[PDB]
Amino acid sequence: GAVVTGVTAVA
Amino acid sequence: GAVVTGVTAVA
Amino acid sequence: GAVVTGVTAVA
Amino acid sequence: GAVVTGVTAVA
Amino acid sequence: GAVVTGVTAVA
Amino acid sequence: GAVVTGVTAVA
Amino acid sequence: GAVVTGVTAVA
Amino acid sequence: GAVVTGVTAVA
Amino acid sequence: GAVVTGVTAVA
Amino acid sequence: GAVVTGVTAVA
Numbered sequence: 001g002a003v004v005t006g007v008t009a010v011a
Numbered sequence: 012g013a014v015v016t017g018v019t020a021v022a
Numbered sequence: 023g024a025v026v027t028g029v030t031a032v033a
Numbered sequence: 034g035a036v037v038t039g040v041t042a043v044a
Numbered sequence: 045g046a047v048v049t050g051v052t053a054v055a
Numbered sequence: 056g057a058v059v060t061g062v063t064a065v066a
Numbered sequence: 067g068a069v070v071t072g073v074t075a076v077a
Numbered sequence: 078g079a080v081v082t083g084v085t086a087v088a
Numbered sequence: 089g090a091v092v093t094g095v096t097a098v099a
Numbered sequence: 100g101a102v103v104t105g106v107t108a109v110a
Contacts, residue, residue, distance in 0.1 A: 002080070009109070013090045015024070025036045032068050077087075
């Protein structure tokens with residue numbers, strides 16, 4: 001099917 | 012300061 | 023300061 | 034200060 | 045101060 | 056079926 | 067089915 | 078099916 | 089400061 | 100199917 005990964009960061 | 016926005020989707 | 027918004031969805 | 038909003042959904 | 049809002053749903 | 060997990064935090 | 071995980075944080 | 082993961086952060 | 093926006097999607 | 104990964108960051 002589908003594997004959707006999102007990361008938005010200020011580290 | 013900081014404005015951090017993240018969207019992860021299967022629409 | 024900080025405004026952090028996250029959305030994770032299957033619509 | 035801080036405004037943190039999170040949404041996780043299957044709609 | 046702080047405004048923290050979380051929503052987890054299957055609608 | 057479905058496994059939906061949401062975490063919103065200021066730690 | 068579906069495995070949806072969301073994390074929104076200020077740590 | 079689907080595996081959707083989202084991370085929004087200020088660490 | 090900083091304005092960080094991320095979008096990850098299968099539409 | 101599909102494997103979609105997105106990273107947006109200020110580290």
